[model samples]
Target chain A: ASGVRIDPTQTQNLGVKTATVTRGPLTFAQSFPANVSYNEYQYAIVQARAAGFIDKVYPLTVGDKVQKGTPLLDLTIPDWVEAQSEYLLLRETGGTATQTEGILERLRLAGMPEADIRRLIATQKIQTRFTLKAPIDGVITAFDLRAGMNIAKDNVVAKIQGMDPVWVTAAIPESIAWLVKDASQFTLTVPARPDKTLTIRKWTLLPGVDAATRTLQLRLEVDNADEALKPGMNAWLQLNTASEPMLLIPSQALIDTGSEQRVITVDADGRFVPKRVAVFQASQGVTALRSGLAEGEKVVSSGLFLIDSEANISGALERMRSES
Target chain B: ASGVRIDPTQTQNLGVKTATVTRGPLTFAQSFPANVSYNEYQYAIVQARAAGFIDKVYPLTVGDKVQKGTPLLDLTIPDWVEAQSEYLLLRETGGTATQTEGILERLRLAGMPEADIRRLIATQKIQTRFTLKAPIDGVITAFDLRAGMNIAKDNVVAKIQGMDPVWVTAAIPESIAWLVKDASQFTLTVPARPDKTLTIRKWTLLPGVDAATRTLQLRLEVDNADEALKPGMNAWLQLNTASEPMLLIPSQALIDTGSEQRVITVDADGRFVPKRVAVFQASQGVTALRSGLAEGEKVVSSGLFLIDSEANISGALERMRS
Candidate 1:
């Protein structure tokens, strides 16, 4: 015990926490909670032009598809009696000065469908309860008015959206902003359908970060030509920045006690040498090594503390310095 | 021309541009000028212990190595003559009237090296120049004293550092601050030696960001065991975060008139579909896919102006309707 003794079993501890060698391009990805939203430019606000009571409610509900000429509701107004009465006289008399096209154009301008105007002109009659048609082909996304309810002029009764395209908003930490840069390819996985992934073609950067939450708002847009990506659905965004081979290592092997990358490496002679390494991000259980050490070099993986203390007591460091 | 004249080439002119299909992760990398410095806590100001005229100076320069117990300088102090004279008289007469160690211990308490006392008792001579030895082993980072320069008490004469760890202060944009969390590992490539990379084990988030620059401070500490890194060196830093695969297209192929992602796609039987796409932050020539279209699909790669119009006009946005 008093004499110099070197143990060969120390070689086992000498195998520093080793990671398999890997090299290539690497992709940095970060995840955040996000909700789906309609591209504002694609949304439409439906309004009533004149004061009237709902006389007939069409099959209108949130999420119901409607065409440009489809009626949403019919409003009966006593104020329209004079215009209708004069139009009826002009059509019944069949006078050449009736301005047939001009009169029909006025009715169509007053929220009546072109189809309705043509039918009324052919029948030659004044009809009560004019139908309010859809201005654009879209889906009803918001409905606040009810049947038999009185609505004033210019009152928004429902909101519609021609969502041929939709937007996904994800807020990631500011630290990972570089993971998904502008113009980089990314995929969105719906939580409801985790297996299928939708491609993102564009991203919009907000002017500033959320002052309170310390996060940046990233608006990703996806084509909903098939109308599969509905508004308000949550999705997991997987952004691929680059691809590279990364080394796999355990978190327990990292020791940053003093803000330095110092890992204890056991040499072939059973001596511990502190080695610093450059590292990329770690995923699962592996770290992508940028530099320091090569593949297949054995290092101290476990029981490094015991080796450090034992070497200090035996003054192995002094002996090595003398020999070198 | 206005009639339903079926033209097979008409759809090709609708709106498509060139794009490349490459397999790799799109990474975000940024480089800026940086000045390497030392952590303020590790810096020390070496000052003179007492007032004296330099009699003999150590042959050392800036960056010279100093060892503990090495005589750094020899100062000639006339006041020490009186103290040494009193010390000799007390030692030869042998008058020990108080305490356990007596008056000789008093001389040891008053800043006298035991070695100096032993020499004084052995020879009974008053040494003119007092030797000032170094208290610690370090390198002279700053040589503020000259060979014949007179120094006063509390005057800084040099700056010594045992082992200086370099601090890299990088400013990150507010947009990407989330990925720079504590304990995040970073790799720094020295611009001078591009092949060599230094690993930063820890990152310290400063108290606040500089308002004028709209950037936060990231303090990185790298070990200098071999003393290779120098202060004020510039390096490139790469930070790792999360990633995903996306559809990327040519940025010029896109005609962005302030809103929407529209692409000219050739439909079956050659009809131009001015389809909208989802895209953001485009690089110099390529645009990334947020959604719409698949890999290997053909699009208008170049010369898009001719296909936009309905054959009669050049560069047309196909009206969306039946």
Candidate 2:
């Protein structure tokens, strides 16, 4: 026999009762104010090199964005000019190959670029001026270097902040702030682009509370590749701080037969069949099935075990066949 | 038979298993900061009376607690002096009693208390000076009155705040402020009395958010009869924001006979008996029984209906009994 058939009149006699499987909402959506800030890792500190005098300074000012290798300032070192001139004079005056190699090594040690040194050897002309380029594509923060400024050889000249991959911070109340550790998912959007809501699964929780305001700050690393989100701009966050949604059924319907849990289902025509269900969690009177069930399927909540006692079919095979 | 006498060996054959009843915690304890302040309803405004000049101002100043009827200042009203003198002349002299009655009414209308007017008539003295006493027991907040200050007939002179009851405020993050409406209960204690924790069940939810700091303020009325809790003092609150605890049993063990719920419990000797239970709520895999069940009791969870089918027991009364 494939399944047991029970008439409508026999429903009460077998004590068979069925309930619809429902999808439950286990997540609460809470909105909070967030602040966009710069990522510290992407900050570039532009430093000054020794033996160089500022010959030219770019017209760019602080807060201006520049690409990698853009010329920021040009410097001329008087020492480099004399060193190159002496090396060239030896090479042209029947200097030995060993002597030429020694001069080139000194120029390299003077912090001259290999390309610049190669040009001096080929052109046989002494070059004293070189341009300092921006090491990273970012916005200028500190710009102290100007034309005619003396190079002390060792100091900070400018600072640039990479606009991409910025951070967004949110301050939550100290009370219940610890509950966010179990948050399932969250997202944020800036006023500049309200439509673009970025889902950030991972979050870095800052240590300690902001005692001044009695709140704990949480940070989210956002992909600001467009450079649209700027530091200090207000952002909105929609945090889902609840359990994920799952398929739920009456707990009484699930019968754990020594090893696995299964439920009896009653088809529209009253044919009773059993299927093994993968249970994820169990609460007061409801059980969540991870798989092996549909949203609106009807399952028997009462009078389960005795209904489908077909002698020939082993309990293991019947439960396994339900999967197929 | 007293009950089903199935031995332990037949437990697996009938698919019968039992689980212990348990008391589960359904509440979460959360702490928050609260601030103590004076209750607005307990505030008393000391207003100036007509035609009075301050004769003497007491040594009391703002922030000093004073009792009801405590003398704060002395005011001399020239108008009351003239009226009382006129009334005393009519009473002491051989004036008609009706004339004296008319003069007494005039003195009463001049804002003089009946007791003061009676004393003026009894002593036959034209008194110009009177003492201003505090109307309520409270701390002085505004004390602008000083000696020789003229009463303009209608202006606030002093303010007193009753310290018997005070308000405690908490600023919760705006995001989860709405969820607090469902909180079950909460209590608070000030640093002044760390050992005392007062349970405050009622709370008035304030409207709107404090957009300045992105928080919502919640207020609680606390008893401050001892006056130990001062305004601006920090108070700690422990809020129980979860449901009440209950006795829970496996949902599978509770059987419904279309009218009530009953559970078959296996006694120590394998004797099976059913007891009707009062069900409060049912969750994932457990049912909370309001009555008819105790903690740690064992009951059959599976293979129920067919095992106890005795013909002598009527389907209505028998199933009803079991």
Candidate 3:
């Protein structure tokens, strides 16, 4: 079929506009203000054993880093001392295996840790006070207990937050959710350490969206083995997404005709031709084509509807002549 | 996103298969039986000059090739003789321009050829009769005149069909309608001339389809200036469509999800990944992908739905755990 023909003067008078289809990678970048936080998965809670008095307190502050088994609180409990003494007497009297097991069970039921119970049996001594140690290597986040303070069973004495893997949390709008993918890398910059930048990997997508913020909360994991990045510090996060190379045209150039999408292409002879193209994605004033186009081809970006009307008139004339 | 993972034993039990993406020229060829016909754009009709009696006819019949100005019929018209004598008398008696213009108009109304009227004026004679000549170089398709037969002014004496370019018409089904393009080349084989095959270019698509046959009409133009290919001759036409290379897969392999089209692909780790793809065209047991697939990638052709079901189960279990 012959496409719509327009002379050079008419083309100039109509003020038609065009842009060349370029081939390259498609990348979108966005920055969000984020804050570093403790990785919740590596947390430990230190609790009291039975009702006791805080006989002694470790020389540690809320921000002090502690290794595994470091003492945190010293507690004196009569219930734990009695349970350990009963187990020691059973072993001295050449008790049967059943009797020995029953006393150890009583000690465990009284909130006596297994390590302390083993120490009492090995030393053959009645230890009245036990020291609570840190369950994991982390910084002390809660240290409210003082020397000679009264405590109850199951009361949380101190909390420790692990420092190996830290979380960088940010909230992003739900509209661009598809741009984020698991295990993708992102650039992180902290103002405190202006000379260094961290590359973090996305860990997972949280289940819920913030209704008030209209945003989805996303978390990225950065290895902080050196403990340089502290919790509650704000950092700038940049996500750079690079997709496959595609044919991109001005977003406004597409003519959506309900059932079909069309674009007015200028042929080699300067004639305007309507072509149907498959659009893969449209965003930020550009559309990537999936098919029906090639690299370096020109497409009309403005004043196309007028040319389309002229093409329709030409088609009608051709039909009229053929019918007669 | 994490895709579905399956053990080697499960893959073997499901009998899963795969095909690698290929890259090459995409070509499709199909043939149809067609026939040669007159190009209506090049037809000419030869009519009688006036109410007359046919005095003589050239030894010409249907299928005879003639050039323009070649004689076809000679007639004796008494009415034409009176009109010509009146025109000659008016001119010889110093008729005014208005009288001459009136005579010229009369000759045209009487169905006289303009060349004959000009010749009469140049020779300054009243010609009683004239010979009808061929209007164009073509083959005679209809001629049924004999000596002494009465004729009317509008009666067709002969019908001429230009022979330089002929039409090869065929009916094409709507399934592969997009394969036809203007000026595209096709191979043609004539049944009458079995040893000779011709390649011709398509001219156009006709405006309508045959309602009963449900096939679109197409025309291809072939040069027959030597008058070798005659109208009404049956021939075979082959259209070999070769477009740009595109990603293709079996038609049945597509998973139509009502709102989206998808395919199950096997990643490098033997995981079943569901991918959305755009289909450009689907026909003849194959579908071409417009995007969302790359060359040399493996796609599951069989037992893909089972993999898809497993993926759904995996997703549900993960959600249940989370």
Candidate 4:
């Protein structure tokens, strides 16, 4: 009742072609700037344990990588020196055996390294100067010390930061931040290290939006165990959203009239009918529909307005044919 | 040399089709909210020129339309009463003719209407009370007068506004304000008055952008002589930017990976070659190109991967064919 009927042989002779309406997805990608920063969680600050004076300063400078047990500074604590000397003198005097045990406990309480005490007990000599060692494996981020500098107990002397994984942050438009929030990972293309393409799995979205720039901030962590991608490096993050299923048809099947769009569909009764359609987007030679056509319906992708104007199209021709 | 060669006969057997790449325009439409306002340039504020007491009040209320020469209020000026009485006595006592001219000049200088002065001279009578008429045809936008109320000199009494044209303003994103700045006109669709579609030709862009909403304001004037649209009425504006000429091709011509996109093109030597292409946007089953293709170039919008991978497509199958 809504469309014009035509002879099946006429459709074939006119070279009219039809296509199917299917549900599928189109790839979506976005590019944004990415800035690399050192991870905030994997960091350590070394502090002096006991009150002492630094007698020897290590030659290693800031920015140098260090391992555990690496010597940082030679510290001479006068308080521990007195305890070690008394313990040694009492053991050399061949005094009360119970008295040696008392001095051993006293030396251990003064924060002396156990390795140094073992040497003191074996040689019967007092050990005052002890070497301060690094507690973790990382690069030296900060160091403030010199030979002959007086150190207070529990004062920070050095700071270390691990470099295996670096934090990457990027600024994006506030509108798009919610559009593809379901995505889990992003492909990072670092301009500095073009040879290596990086993947960012673990990430976070900062809660607030910037008013002036109209942007939101997202931070992602990427592997940099080889130190190729260093802090302060700039890169591009390709945002990839999953392709969702939606009704799709050939783009040429639709007609646009400035204010609205419509497509010519073949109904179940084998008639060509024009139906208004709301298109979500047109891409990849196909158009995704928000509404109007159902899945599995056939549409005329290639046709001349000649047939459309006849029967229901060309009104005079329909009258002439009926009269004949 | 870079692409795979094809036999002329095989092209027909394979059902290959070709399309032309050229420069053209696409439909660009954007929707934004429009708010109706009174034209700022066509406004007036009427003030009392002389101190007087309002003896009679007009029944017309605020928002009423008035015409030029329409009476608004009857004012009795005590100062004018003395001047007018002196003039009439001198005229009847056979006073100097030039003396009457001096009183006439004084009355004119006091802002009395010319019509009122002419009537007084014709009747040879003392005229102290005058009816104030409107200076222009417009609606009363403001009024602050009551019966028997004393009005000070230079005090505001009423405001009038013309309604032939209304100002329509809309807020748009700051990024897009500059995008369509070159456009001259837009189509306005008023939901309240859906029967009529309007066109806005002259408009202005506000200098400052809103920091909080990240929106730029644009103002336009539209004809509303019939009073069909009123102030504070909301509508939608269809922003129609000129469809500029750009390189365009079918959307299916480019193959899009998750990161980059490329297209298969036929060289002048008659070979199918794949080349990288950068796309600006895709709409209406067509795409606008930023770079990597040229006018009059041939691209395979529809083709099997088997041909694209041959010398250029499938390496093992290419060796077998050779």
lDDT of 2 by residue, A90-113 (tens): 877878989888888988887777
Residue-by-residue lDDT tens digits, candidate 4, A1-324: 356777766665555667888877754557888666667777888877576555566755455667787888876665665677678777768879799878888878867777888988887776656788887766676776543245667657778776567778888898887445655447776644434557676877888877887888888888876665555556677776546677788876777776767677887887787667788876545778888778899988655354556534535333433442
Worst 10 residues of 1 chain A by lDDT: A1-10
Give the Å shift of residue B116 in candidate 3. 2.9
Compute the lDDT for candidate 1: 0.57
Candidate 3 ranges with C-alpha deviation above 4 Å: A1-324, B1-14, B21-25, B56-67, B78-82, B91-106, B118-125, B144-149, B170-173, B182-184, B194-218, B255-261, B267-277, B282-286, B291-297, B303-322
**Candidate 1 on A171-275: residue-level lDDT in tens?**
878876766665456667664333235767678878788878888888877776655554555666666566456553444454545554544554555445555
The runs of at least 3 residues in candidate 1 whose Cα sits more than 4 Å from the true structure, single-residue gaps closed, are A1-17, A20-26, A38-42, A58-71, A77-113, A120-128, A133-144, A161-166, A174-179, A183-202, A211-214, A222-254, A264-273, A278-324, B1-322
Give the TM-scores of the predictions, in the order they appear: 0.38, 0.34, 0.40, 0.43
lDDT of 4 at B264: 69
lDDT of each: 0.57, 0.67, 0.69, 0.68
Candidate 2 stretches with Cα past 4 Å from truth are A1-324, B1-28, B93-102, B174-178, B207-211, B214-216, B243-322
lDDT for each residue of candidate 3 in B172-251, tens digit (9 for 90 to 100): 65444445532277788888876668776645554333445545566777887567778889988888777556788866
Query: Which 10 residues in a row give candidate 4 chain A its minimum summed lDDT?
Result: A315-324
Best-first order by lDDT: 3, 4, 2, 1
- Give interface RMSD, per candidate: 38.9, 27.8, 54.0, 30.6
Error of 2 at A115 (Å): 99
Best by lDDT: 3
DockQ of 1: 0.00
